[PDB]
Amino acid sequence: NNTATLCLGHHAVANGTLVKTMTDDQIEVTNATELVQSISMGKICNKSYRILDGRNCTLIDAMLGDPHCDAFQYESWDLFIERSNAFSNCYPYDIPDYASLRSIVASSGTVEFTAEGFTWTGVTQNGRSGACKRGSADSFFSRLNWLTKSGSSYPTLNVTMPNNKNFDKLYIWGIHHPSSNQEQTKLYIQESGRVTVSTKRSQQTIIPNIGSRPLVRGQSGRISIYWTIVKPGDILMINSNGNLVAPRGYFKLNTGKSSVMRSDVPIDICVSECITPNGSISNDKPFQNVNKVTYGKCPKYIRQNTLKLATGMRNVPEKQ
Amino acid sequence: NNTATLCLGHHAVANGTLVKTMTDDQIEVTNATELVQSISMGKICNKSYRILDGRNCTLIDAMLGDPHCDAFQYESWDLFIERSNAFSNCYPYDIPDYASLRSIVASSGTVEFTAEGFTWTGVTQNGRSGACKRGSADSFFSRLNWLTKSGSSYPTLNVTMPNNKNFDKLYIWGIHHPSSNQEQTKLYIQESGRVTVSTKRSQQTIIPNIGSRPLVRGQSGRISIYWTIVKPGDILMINSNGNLVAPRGYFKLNTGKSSVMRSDVPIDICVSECITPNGSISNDKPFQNVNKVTYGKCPKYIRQNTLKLATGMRNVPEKQ
Amino acid sequence: NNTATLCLGHHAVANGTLVKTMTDDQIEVTNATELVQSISMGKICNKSYRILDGRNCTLIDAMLGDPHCDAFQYESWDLFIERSNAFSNCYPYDIPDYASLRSIVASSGTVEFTAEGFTWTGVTQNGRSGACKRGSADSFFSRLNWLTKSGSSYPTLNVTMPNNKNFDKLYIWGIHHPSSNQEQTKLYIQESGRVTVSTKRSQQTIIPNIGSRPLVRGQSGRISIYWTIVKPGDILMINSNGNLVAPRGYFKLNTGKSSVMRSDVPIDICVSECITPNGSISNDKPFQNVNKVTYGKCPKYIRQNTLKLATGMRNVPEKQ
Amino acid sequence: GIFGAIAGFIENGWEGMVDGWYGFRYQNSEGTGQAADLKSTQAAIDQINGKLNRVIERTNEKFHQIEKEFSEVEGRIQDLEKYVEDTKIDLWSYNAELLVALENQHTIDLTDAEMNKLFEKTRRQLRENAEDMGDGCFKIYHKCDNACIESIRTGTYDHYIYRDEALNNRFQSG
Amino acid sequence: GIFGAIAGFIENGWEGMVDGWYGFRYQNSEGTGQAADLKSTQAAIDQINGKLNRVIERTNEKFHQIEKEFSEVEGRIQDLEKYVEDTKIDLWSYNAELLVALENQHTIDLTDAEMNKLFEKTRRQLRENAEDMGDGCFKIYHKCDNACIESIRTGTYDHYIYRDEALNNRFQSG
Amino acid sequence: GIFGAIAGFIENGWEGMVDGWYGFRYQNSEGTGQAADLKSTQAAIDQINGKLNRVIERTNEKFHQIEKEFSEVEGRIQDLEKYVEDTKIDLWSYNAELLVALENQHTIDLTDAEMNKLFEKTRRQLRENAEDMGDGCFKIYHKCDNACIESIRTGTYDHYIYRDEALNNRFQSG
Numbered sequence A, B, C: 001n002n003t004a005t006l007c008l009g010h011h012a013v014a015n016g017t018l019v020k021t022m023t024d025d026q027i028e029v030t031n032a033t034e035l036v037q038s039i040s041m042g043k044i045c046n047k048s049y050r051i052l053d054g055r056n057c058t059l060i061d062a063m064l065g066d067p068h069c070d071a072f073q074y075e076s077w078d079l080f081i082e083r084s085n086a087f088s089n090c091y092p093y094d095i096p097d098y099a100s101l102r103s104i105v106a107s108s109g110t111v112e113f114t115a116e117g118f119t120w121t122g123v124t125q126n127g128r129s130g131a132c133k134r135g136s137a138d139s140f141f142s143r144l145n146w147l148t149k150s151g152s153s154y155p156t157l158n159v160t161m162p163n164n165k166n167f168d169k170l171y172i173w174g175i176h177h178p179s180s181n182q183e184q185t186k187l188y189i190q191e192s193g194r195v196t197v198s199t200k201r202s203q204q205t206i207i208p209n210i211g212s213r214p215l216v217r218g219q220s221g222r223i224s225i226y227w228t229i230v231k232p233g234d235i236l237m238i239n240s241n242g243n244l245v246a247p248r249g250y251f252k253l254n255t256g257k258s259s260v261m262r263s264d265v266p267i268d269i270c271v272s273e274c275i276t277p278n279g280s281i282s283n284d285k286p287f288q289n290v291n292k293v294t295y296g297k298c299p300k301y302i303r304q305n306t307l308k309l310a311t312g313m314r315n316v317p318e319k320q
Numbered sequence D, E, F: 001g002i003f004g005a006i007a008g009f010i011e012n013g014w015e016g017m018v019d020g021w022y023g024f025r026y027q028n029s030e031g032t033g034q035a036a037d038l039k040s041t042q043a044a045i046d047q048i049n050g051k052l053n054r055v056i057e058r059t060n061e062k063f064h065q066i067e068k069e070f071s072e073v074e075g076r077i078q079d080l081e082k083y084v085e086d087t088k089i090d091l092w093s094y095n096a097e098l099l100v101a102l103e104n105q106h107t108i109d110l111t112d113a114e115m116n117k118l119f120e121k122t123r124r125q126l127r128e129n130a131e132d133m134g135d136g137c138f139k140i141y142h143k144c145d146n147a148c149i150e151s152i153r154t155g156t157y158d159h160y161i162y163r164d165e166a167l168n169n170r171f172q173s174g
């Protein structure tokens, strides 16, 4: 009539949301959004990154060139996947600091092996083995060269290889630990051998140990693997009285954005920018409770499984 | 009469408190609470955790079984305390990576030693020493087995032990470094000995060094200790031309919430949930300035010695 | 006339500043201040800290006493600068864990070498070399003592030195790796030598390796350097069948606030309290984008190159 | 919140308000009405989206790093690697906790503020022609049809023309 | 704080107020009086306890870790272990500093807010029957005995029954 | 900000105000005028300097640490050293980001608050002698020369002596 009334107010929903404040553990607001990524895609997205399935092979065995890991000869990757059921089928071995060498390959992100024309006169090359078959016949590692006696002598080898390339060359070599006195002599003449590898900058001399170990695929002998880097300008050199497993060339070291991960989930035709052992995960949220192990453009991992950030006002429905 | 006055106001105290804000370094409020735990209980609470006093013994000597550390034969702990005045009384020794082995015991949280029935034919067992007395008579480490010549021979030992248990077995062994040429021969026949220990997965061959060191409790010879893990399915193996100090069995590795700490304070009959070298400390406050070394459910350590969080309003007393 | 009007307001500038809030990426305020230190002084301020220019020398070569690094005999520092073009001119070498020893010197912050009166009877001292010249004549490292045969014998040396000082003595020693069989014998009589160094607490036996390496300043032989600490009360001891490069005394270990850094910028007569490889930087701002490598009282390094903290109100100029 | 408007002197919210987040209901010569206020609604929403944008979609590429889980028992190195990762996680976990806590406290207050702003703004338009009823409503002391009200929502209300009328009704017995 | 109430237009606090944190003093036909306001006091306290609960008693079990102090000089590993621990401590030390800073600034404002709330709330009850004296007091322009005042503190004050009287006294020479 | 004063009901700022950060302009019997308010200006500035002091010039001595860049390829140790440093930097980088974000949001609101404070303060002095025009100006309903105005800026304005006059002009046709 001759007055009016004007009431101010705000909206409210029926099914609201709880959130944390500085003063409240659970206070109700109209809306909120989840900042924690809890669930994973399920499987590994082939995109956007160059993924590589390890299957029956570990990275080290692909580097080495274990016959059943010859598929990965010419292969590079952004991320290399190692499966739990993978294994070795070649001559039994062990590496001092396996990890470091694994890491150094994975980071470079390739197994492409540039061969070099090494010469070793007075010694027979290409040693075979009944516990490392390529096809049906006895073979060895594709990228390592087992040197043994020629005729009735194993002469002290002194061989070099200058790195005149524009980059660090990675070299991979080893040494044979025989099972008995009689294998040592009957294969390398001398009763105790040595392997000194060195450059202008460094050295590493190894001496092997005779005596039988447990059988691993029918071998009580062992082959310990070592490596060496060579900076542009520097020269490689090998000295061997006996028991050397020589190299066939080098791997080239690239400063890579590559790596390796241990996962068991199938790879599939989805897409994502970040990868964990549980599978690929969605990128958009700032945090994650899937797995502290991750690769790529990828959320931060945190202990909590849900952190709701309020995206609306305090919800105050009519009181009964 | 025909008006009234109604004044709004807030309380205030006489003896207030200073606190920090974003804009003030020292501003006065009615009340505040301390978030930094500065002082300690004084001593170590036997509860709630299973505490163990090291006294005259270090953890390694209890593992090893130094005669004066035979009290800890059957002992496990949540936290093991090492005292500064503790020492060794057995044969002088040194370990490559003492820490790692200390840590690996402490984490497992026990010294209980399951014996195994090893055999070593052609060699006399249980070597004694004048610098490791159990009772009055010459003894050795309880859990290590000094092997020496039998008659006029020390035959190349080749001994195995399969781990068919449901867990990783930890094995502890060593090697004798003699003082002179004549102790080497007059105790192990051969002039230079070897100790290869190995499994399907790994190896570790040691060779000893003859020549006198400084006397430690009247011994210029040394005994270097090594260890080995064995995963279920795998097999242990020892090969020794000479100078081996054999094992008597294994320690069982549990995935424990145990650890070790260096403290000098007395243990007592109080209670707490967190422990430092200065003593147990109160749990309730979120921070602490006692010591960065701690165990259990325990506040965070921070550089500052007091951080008062205001628990009341700004205190504004009447102005003069 | 018979009313008035009173308008409240705030100031505003013409050329304002943008800043980030919780709700805005770029919002305009009257004023702001920069919290990130982006640019560097340009060069290294000799003050306030004791700076030392490495020039042609690395820290290790000054420790060792490479003839061309004799300038640094009596020198200590707060911060020691290593130049990229520096080098070695003495006998070619390599250290197991170069870094650790570098770090251990740098932290102690001095090269002052206390000599000790060692005796070695039956062996000639002060071995010279054509690839380590002091002046024009053939010299060696000033602080290492190359021992060789005297007459027709190299007797097994057994030499001690008790640390009765009030501190840990740091000792530096090495071993000769010959180029051929005939240098070994024609310089140390025996065909295979040994170097055991030990104390009450520890040991370290080295055995050298014969065989030629690449030439480094005309030497296919090598000299590997090792070190040893000795705690007050303990005794030093050396045992050498052959190939030992003996020590001339010790370095004293101080618990220092010293360090070492790799920089190429000139040192100059400015002043600052913090130092990076790019030069000294201004202290006053809490953050920095210059370099994660720093020394002294020095801002925190962060990824962002500018973070403006608003120091005035929201700037609201008159609208057109 | 800190303004005592939402969850305060405004007793409760309106589930029927779907046009926006803030607005008016009224009662005049022409019946009853409801309407939203865009300016204020959009002022609130613009901020929350500010927040979101800051927090969401700001991820960093990380490639080869360390191992964070091991099978073999090693000791001093694995210990260090675990503790190191352990620390990272804890530190970040705290940041994420405190973050939402801060933001949300702010979001609440932020939205409360905007409720008080639209109130005072409105109050200021009415000048002497109305009285705060204390429930978030003004009694307007003059006939104010839908066009009049509109004017208020528009910001174009001219008080000088109702003043005499309003003042009349505001001040007598009767 | 930001509301200018505490340490502001309320000149100072009352040491005599022990019933609570906020309240009234008055002067009427029946003498002088003081009284607390529970609602507001409890509204403030509930929040601070919110804060406390969040920060206090939220500790985590941690067991075997690394060593953080050493006797032997080692080099590249001990360096790494020290620096690593060193870093943790510094990072956490900053969190604890900033925490109290944030909280306290908030606690102050929070308490200031509640002072302004009870004021406006009260103001709104009185409607046209009183005037803000600007010192945190209202001159009420009508006889208001203890029951009347009570009504105000209760929230049950009906202005329509004093309005004529109050308006009278508010507006004349005399 | 949250008070709706700056960048709100105060339409814009005054580039001509150089005496300070806050103040008055007016229009009276004696002409037009501008003047600053020190109390309020200095209240704002004192706080920002509080902030600065806290953040600026609080550096810590750090000496020998780890290496953070390497030439030789090593593996498990260098990896750990890089990742460890990498982590520190990221964690600190986040702190610095959030810091300025927090502070600035606060600085804005802080300055907005002070604008509202001086307003309400002034309002409260005028009591019944003036009306909020809603643009940050009061129409004062009585002759108020420069001394009168001064009194307001001084805080010494006595309303009881103009009240009758003001009330007169506030309430009639004419």
Ligand SMILES: *[C@@H]1O[C@H](CO)[C@@H](O[C@@H]2O[C@H](CO)[C@@H](OC3O[C@H](CO)[C@@H](O)[C@H](O)[C@@H]3O)[C@H](O)[C@H]2NC(C)=O)[C@H](O)[C@H]1NC(C)=O
Binding pocket: A212, A215, B158, B159, B160
């Ligand atoms: C040192 O000692 C160990 C054990 O004492 C010896 O290992 C034995 O080696 C056997 C072959 O030489 C091998 O026995 C066999 O039995 C299984 C049956 O399923 C089959 O795989 C083959 O028939 C295989 O030959 C075992 O590995 C082991 N024997 C037993 C009974 O465990 C090792 O040869 C010794 N080495 C020396 C003396 O140099």
Ligand SMILES: *[C@@H]1O[C@H](CO)[C@@H](O[C@@H]2O[C@H](CO)[C@@H](OC3O[C@H](CO)[C@@H](O)[C@H](O)[C@@H]3O)[C@H](O)[C@H]2NC(C)=O)[C@H](O)[C@H]1NC(C)=O
Binding pocket: B212, B215, C158, C159, C160
């Ligand atoms: C190599 O050289 C060192 C020192 O040059 C020899 O150490 C000596 O060993 C002594 C026993 O052989 C021992 O001397 C003794 O004196 C103290 C007196 O309090 C007592 O504890 C005993 O009587 C003890 O026998 C010392 O440890 C030391 N001598 C001195 C004078 O410091 C070591 O035996 C040599 N080893 C060889 C040649 O194999």
Ligand SMILES: *[C@@H]1O[C@H](CO)[C@@H](O[C@@H]2O[C@H](CO)[C@@H](OC3O[C@H](CO)[C@@H](O)[C@H](O)[C@@H]3O)[C@H](O)[C@H]2NC(C)=O)[C@H](O)[C@H]1NC(C)=O
Binding pocket: A158, A159, A160, C212, C215
């Ligand atoms: C083992 O093999 C390597 C290479 O096969 C030998 O290195 C040679 O050593 C030469 C000196 O003995 C040296 O040749 C020289 O040529 C350059 C010309 O600019 C000059 O610096 C000198 O004339 C120098 O003598 C080279 O370093 C290298 N020769 C070549 C052709 O690369 C090494 O001596 C062998 N060591 C043995 C058998 O013990």
Ligand SMILES: *[C@@H]1O[C@H](CO)[C@@H](O[C@@H]2O[C@H](CO)[C@@H](O)[C@H](O)[C@H]2NC(C)=O)[C@H](O)[C@H]1NC(C)=O
Binding pocket: A031, A032, A033, A034, A311
């Ligand atoms: C309430 O929050 C939900 C999600 O927490 C919002 O739902 C989405 O809206 C955003 C807005 O851009 C979209 O990007 C997403 O596609 C939606 N996600 C989901 C899971 O639904 C919703 O917008 C909010 N409600 C509002 C604003 O009314």
Ligand SMILES: *[C@@H]1O[C@H](CO)[C@@H](O[C@@H]2O[C@H](CO)[C@@H](O)[C@H](O)[C@H]2NC(C)=O)[C@H](O)[C@H]1NC(C)=O
Binding pocket: A055, A056
């Ligand atoms: C990889 O190796 C597996 C495991 O040996 C091969 O598996 C074959 O098929 C069954 C079931 O998977 C296994 O039980 C047998 O061990 C294998 N068959 C035979 C006849 O030996 C598998 O074929 C291999 N795949 C690739 C791609 O290399």
Ligand SMILES: *[C@@H]1O[C@H](CO)[C@@H](O[C@@H]2O[C@H](CO)[C@@H](O)[C@H](O)[C@H]2NC(C)=O)[C@H](O)[C@H]1NC(C)=O
Binding pocket: A038, A277, A278, A289, A290, A291
């Ligand atoms: C994601 O998968 C990981 C493995 O990559 C899970 O981690 C394991 O799961 C068990 C729970 O059954 C936990 O005890 C350990 O954390 C892990 N154990 C082993 C032996 O690896 C993890 O739980 C999964 N998490 C999510 C969210 O899917």
Ligand SMILES: *[C@@H]1O[C@H](CO)[C@@H](O[C@@H]2O[C@H](CO)[C@@H](O)[C@H](O)[C@H]2NC(C)=O)[C@H](O)[C@H]1NC(C)=O
Binding pocket: B031, B032, B033, B034, B311
């Ligand atoms: C002022 O603060 C002090 C401590 O800083 C408070 O004292 C305690 O009150 C709490 C409340 O639950 C109790 O848990 C503790 O047992 C008390 N501790 C100590 C050391 O006295 C006190 O409550 C506060 N004063 C108030 C609220 O009036």
Ligand SMILES: *[C@@H]1O[C@H](CO)[C@@H](O[C@@H]2O[C@H](CO)[C@@H](O)[C@H](O)[C@H]2NC(C)=O)[C@H](O)[C@H]1NC(C)=O
Binding pocket: B055, B056
């Ligand atoms: C642990 O060893 C200590 C130190 O040797 C023993 O101390 C005995 O008593 C006094 C004073 O404590 C020492 O000075 C002597 O060295 C020791 N006495 C004798 C006769 O040798 C202590 O008895 C030992 N305690 C335990 C529980 O093993």
Ligand SMILES: *[C@@H]1O[C@H](CO)[C@@H](O[C@@H]2O[C@H](CO)[C@@H](O)[C@H](O)[C@H]2NC(C)=O)[C@H](O)[C@H]1NC(C)=O
Binding pocket: B038, B277, B278, B289, B290, B291
């Ligand atoms: C708690 O005890 C620790 C030892 O566990 C103290 O640390 C030592 O104390 C001195 C001060 O006298 C400091 O220089 C060093 O931090 C420590 N030195 C050595 C040799 O250990 C610590 O000061 C004590 N702190 C408190 C709060 O009780």
Ligand SMILES: *[C@@H]1O[C@H](CO)[C@@H](O[C@@H]2O[C@H](CO)[C@@H](O)[C@H](O)[C@H]2NC(C)=O)[C@H](O)[C@H]1NC(C)=O
Binding pocket: C031, C032, C033, C034, C311
């Ligand atoms: C606006 O900010 C600038 C710098 O960001 C201020 O300039 C300085 O003022 C401070 C005040 O103590 C001095 O310490 C510095 O010497 C000045 N630095 C530079 C680079 O000019 C300026 O004061 C601010 N303007 C004001 C407050 O009006």
Ligand SMILES: *[C@@H]1O[C@H](CO)[C@@H](O[C@@H]2O[C@H](CO)[C@@H](O)[C@H](O)[C@H]2NC(C)=O)[C@H](O)[C@H]1NC(C)=O
Binding pocket: C055, C056
């Ligand atoms: C440090 O060594 C340098 C590099 O050898 C010396 O440089 C001399 O001068 C020129 C130009 O710098 C170089 O090309 C030559 O190699 C050096 N000259 C000669 C005659 O050999 C420099 O003199 C040395 N300086 C110090 C202080 O030791």
Ligand SMILES: *[C@@H]1O[C@H](CO)[C@@H](O[C@@H]2O[C@H](CO)[C@@H](O)[C@H](O)[C@H]2NC(C)=O)[C@H](O)[C@H]1NC(C)=O
Binding pocket: C038, C277, C278, C289, C290, C291
């Ligand atoms: C400061 O100097 C450092 C070197 O101490 C610079 O770091 C190098 O610069 C390049 C850019 O040209 C970057 O790719 C790398 O970070 C560094 N490379 C090498 C080989 O060291 C750094 O860029 C400089 N930064 C500033 C702000 O001056």
Ligand SMILES: *[C@@H]1O[C@H](CO)[C@@H](O)[C@H](O)[C@H]1NC(C)=O
Binding pocket: A014, A015
């Ligand atoms: C809200 O949720 C309840 C229970 O889940 C459901 O029955 C109802 O239909 C929903 N109603 C709304 C959003 O109005």
Ligand SMILES: *[C@@H]1O[C@H](CO)[C@@H](O)[C@H](O)[C@H]1NC(C)=O
Binding pocket: B014, B015
């Ligand atoms: C406050 O403290 C002073 C000095 O410590 C003391 O003398 C006085 O009795 C106390 N008075 C209070 C809390 O009223």
Ligand SMILES: *[C@@H]1O[C@H](CO)[C@@H](O)[C@H](O)[C@H]1NC(C)=O
Binding pocket: C014, C015
């Ligand atoms: C502001 O900056 C502009 C462009 O840089 C310049 O031309 C002008 O003179 C400045 N004027 C001011 C601060 O009033």
